[PDB]
Design an enzyme around this catalytic site. Sequence first.
Site, PDB file in Angstrom:
ATOM      1  CB  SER A   1      18.863  20.931 -10.028  1.00 61.90           C
ATOM      2  OG  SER A   1      19.716  22.039 -10.268  1.00 61.90           O
TER       3      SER A   1
ATOM      4  CG  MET B   1       9.485  19.002  -6.919  1.00 67.98           C
ATOM      5  SD  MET B   1      10.130  20.559  -6.320  1.00 67.98           S
ATOM      6  CE  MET B   1       8.730  21.578  -6.590  1.00 67.98           C
ATOM      7  NE  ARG B   2       3.902  14.256  -2.922  1.00 68.39           N
ATOM      8  CZ  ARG B   2       2.623  14.237  -3.276  1.00 68.39           C
ATOM      9  NH1 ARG B   2       2.254  14.757  -4.438  1.00 68.39           N
ATOM     10  NH2 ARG B   2       1.712  13.705  -2.472  1.00 68.39           N
TER      11      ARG B   2
ATOM     12  CG  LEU C   1      10.559  14.421   2.846  1.00 68.14           C
ATOM     13  CD1 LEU C   1      12.075  14.653   3.009  1.00 68.14           C
ATOM     14  CD2 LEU C   1      10.254  12.990   2.421  1.00 68.14           C
TER      15      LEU C   1
ATOM     16  CG  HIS D   1      15.752  28.143  -0.880  1.00 70.19           C
ATOM     17  ND1 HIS D   1      14.603  27.545  -1.353  1.00 70.19           N
ATOM     18  CD2 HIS D   1      15.498  29.474  -0.848  1.00 70.19           C
ATOM     19  CE1 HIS D   1      13.694  28.472  -1.598  1.00 70.19           C
ATOM     20  NE2 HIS D   1      14.211  29.650  -1.294  1.00 70.19           N
TER      21      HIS D   1
ATOM     22  CE  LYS E   1      20.503  25.172 -10.499  1.00 72.42           C
ATOM     23  NZ  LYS E   1      19.653  24.471  -9.473  1.00 72.42           N
TER      24      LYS E   1
ATOM     25  CB  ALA F   1      26.894  29.864  -6.151  1.00 70.70           C
ATOM     26  CD  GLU F   2      21.307  25.999  -6.285  1.00 69.69           C
ATOM     27  OE1 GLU F   2      21.135  25.040  -7.072  1.00 69.69           O
ATOM     28  OE2 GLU F   2      20.368  26.631  -5.750  1.00 69.69           O
TER      29      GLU F   2
END
EC number: 6.3.4.13
Length: 202
Positions: A12, A89-90, A92, A108, A167, A169-170
């Site tokens: 995304s 999705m992990r 770090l 976010h 989205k 806006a992102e």
Amino acid sequence: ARVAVLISGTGSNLQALIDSTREPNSSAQIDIVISNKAAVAGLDKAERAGIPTRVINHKLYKNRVEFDSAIDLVLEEFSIDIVCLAGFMRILSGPFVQKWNGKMLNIHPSLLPSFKGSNAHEQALETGVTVTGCTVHFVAEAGQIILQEAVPVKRGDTVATLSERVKLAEHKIFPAALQLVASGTVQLGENGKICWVKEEHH
């Protein structure tokens, strides 16, 4: 600045990031997209755009530190200056996060510090706020905020309609924040706070 994007799925905002770097006065180039999952949509996006990709499978490493070190090695081989996380999705490791301090961005779908964690749109709706938004920030153990954009919640909104509005806006602020950091206009100060810099070069 040479930029890597780490993903785990659809990547995304990746196309928004790619598009921005093609613009005339871009201070950034996307040089690699790395996924911890094979054959995800984000890899296809990168590949279709002519950007190198790598897949680093966490199941092939003893622990989190070994896995992140493998990611870092690829970043080192590609001479990467800045990392953007697009749906990675992990978690770090501390050592990885420390090395990339002030050089790694994430986004976010809320106005942090509200609605931390997953399902921020559902959280906003359940809470009944009339204003939500998105936040791009440096990554920390959280992390210093670079840009935020407020987005209205409309009467009758569903998770889908609010998500689509956030989205959009992102798509605007992720590339804008990347450009600020890539250009050196926004840097992380030695005191750990955001610093807006006036550049010598005119």
